[PDB]
Amino acid sequence: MGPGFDFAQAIMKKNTVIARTEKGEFTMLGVYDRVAVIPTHASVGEIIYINDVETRVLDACALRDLTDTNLEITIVKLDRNQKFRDIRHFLPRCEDDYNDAVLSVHTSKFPNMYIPVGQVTNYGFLNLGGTPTHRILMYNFPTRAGQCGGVVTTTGKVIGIHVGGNGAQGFAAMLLHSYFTD
Numbered sequence: 001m002g003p004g005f006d007f008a009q010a011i012m013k014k015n016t017v018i019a020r021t022e023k024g025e026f027t028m029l030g031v032y033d034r035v036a037v038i039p040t041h042a043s044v045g046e047i048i049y050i051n052d053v054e055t056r057v058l059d060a061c062a063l064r065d066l067t068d069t070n071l072e073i074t075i076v077k078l079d080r081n082q083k084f085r086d087i088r089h090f091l092p093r094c095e096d097d098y099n100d101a102v103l104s105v106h107t108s109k110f111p112n113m114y115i116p117v118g119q120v121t122n123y124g125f126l127n128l129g130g131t132p133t134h135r136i137l138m139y140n141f142p143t144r145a146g147q148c149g150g151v152v153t154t155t156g157k158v159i160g161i162h163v164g165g166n167g168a169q170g171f172a173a174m175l176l177h178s179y180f181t182d
């Protein structure tokens with residue numbers, strides 16, 4: 001509908017796949033080469049389904065900060081025959097607050113879904129499903145089951161992936177450029 005939705009759509013149309021684990025179907029962001037991200041609660045194993053194709057997992061790393069606190073981001077390298085467009089230059093370098101973000105989801109349950117979530121707070125610490133978690137972003141939208149893995153964007157920046165909610169607020173794990181130096 002406007003330039004925020006334009007940037008979100010450009011990311012969804014080239015840099016997302018549908019990931020299926022034994023814990024459900026997730027929006028999955030591809031970042032570069034065969035490297036993608038997914039919430040750590042997806043419990044990625046040795047095999048994952050990518051757009052309903054059986055795919056070997058070459059590597060999976062559940063990120064934690066240097067205090068050994070959960071970040072809720074798993075970086076997955078996929079045995080896929082095709083690379084993602086490199087979008088690492090759209091990742092923020094530092095923790096920050098944002099205005100006017102969009103949350104975008106693409107699954108069997110929620111195809112071509114875009115939500116203007118408004119202002120995004122650097123919330124920091126969250127007890128997420130009982131797990132102490134750091135680098136959480138918060139937005140005041142009543143997000144629902146089916147949205148985990150959804151991509152959080154502003155114009156020109158890919159800032160996080162949706163990992164939870166409390167009924168009135170939604171929570172995303174930050175994406176930082178430093179996670180994807182190779």
Ligand SMILES: CS(=O)(=O)Nc1ccc(C(=O)O)cc1
Nearest residue numbers: 068069070071129130131132
């Ligand atoms: C599932 S549980 O919450 O009962 N036990 C856990 C699991 C994971 C972590 C973590 O830091 O990743 C902490 C506690």
